[PDB]
């Protein structure tokens, strides 16, 4: 998410991502382990 | 300094009901005391051995025996939630308003740990609700400090 983005906003996007995989890829995906506040570029509320 | 006296103290602590009965018959002193003034009835009450409390009282043990700091079997029974033992001690004429060296009573100790059932039984046997310890604290004060509203209601 962009600069200053909050935990709550990032959780909405991870929920959209989680829902997609358990819906449009229901046949292929077993589970989604969503992690709010950690990325490979860096960590904080605007990363997941 | 009797050998059978020391065995009874150790026996009554571990909860050996049959070994107590044997030592009673062998003529062991029921009112034998520790270095700290604890009797078998003190230890039976503390560790919560009901049958031994009943057996010791049947063989003429001092129900109001006090340790070197003024605490009685009822203090220990009431403090650590041994409701059945509190009833038996009180049935055998235990001093419900007994003060230790701090002025602490069975009602204070029961209220401290929020033992509602024990508090209500102590009150039935005529526990002084207005009794103060050396700091001027009542059971009600203790209940308020701990944030126990159920217990505070009972003492009001």
């Amino acid at each position: 998410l962009p600069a200053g983005a909050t935990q709550e906003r990032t959780q909405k996007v991870l929920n959209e991502v989680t829902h997609y995989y358990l819906t449009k890829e229901k046949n292929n995906v077993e589970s989604v382990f969503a992690v709010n506040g950690f990325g490979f570029a860096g960590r904080g509320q605007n990363t997941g | 300094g009797s050998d059978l006296g020391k065995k009874l103290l150790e026996a009554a602590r571990a909860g050996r009901d049959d070994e107590v009965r044997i030592l009673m018959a062998n003529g062991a002193d029921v009112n034998a005391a520790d270095v700290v003034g604890w009797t078998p009835l003190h230890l039976a009450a503390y560790w919560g051995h009901l049958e031994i409390v009943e057996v010791l009282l049947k063989n003429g043990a001092d129900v109001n025996a006090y340790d070197t700091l003024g605490s009685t079997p009822l203090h220990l029974a009431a403090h650590f939630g041994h409701l059945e033992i509190v009833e038996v001690l009180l049935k055998n004429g235990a001093d419900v308003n007994a003060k230790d060296d701090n002025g602490i009573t069975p009602l204070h100790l029961a209220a401290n740990r929020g033992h509602l059932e024990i508090v209500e039984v102590l009150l039935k046997y005529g526990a002084d609700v207005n009794a103060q310890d050396k700091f001027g604290k009542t059971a009600f004060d203790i209940s308020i400090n701990n944030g126990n509203e159920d217990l505070a209601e009972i003492l009001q």
């Binding site: 935990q7 959780q11 991870l14 929920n15 989680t18 829902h19 358990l22 589970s31 989604v32 382990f33 969503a34 992690v35 709010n36 506040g37 950690f38 960590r43 904080g44 509320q45 | 400090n145 701990n146 944030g147």
Partner: protein, 48 residues
């Protein structure tokens, strides 16, 4: 316990009333840190 932490006497007022820690704060068991939220198919999760 939260109860014992609540009883911490912060000060005694001049009138003789008591200010306990629970009179100035809420007291609960929580995390050391709240910067990471983990989920497994949308439901709360931890892991190793």
């Amino acid at each position: 316990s939260t109860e014992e932490f609540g009883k911490i006497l912060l000060k005694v007022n001049q009138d003789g009333s008591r200010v306990l820690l629970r009179d100035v704060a809420k007291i609960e068991l929580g995390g050391e840190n709240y910067d990471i939220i983990a989920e497994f198919n949308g439901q709360p999760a931890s892991g190793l």
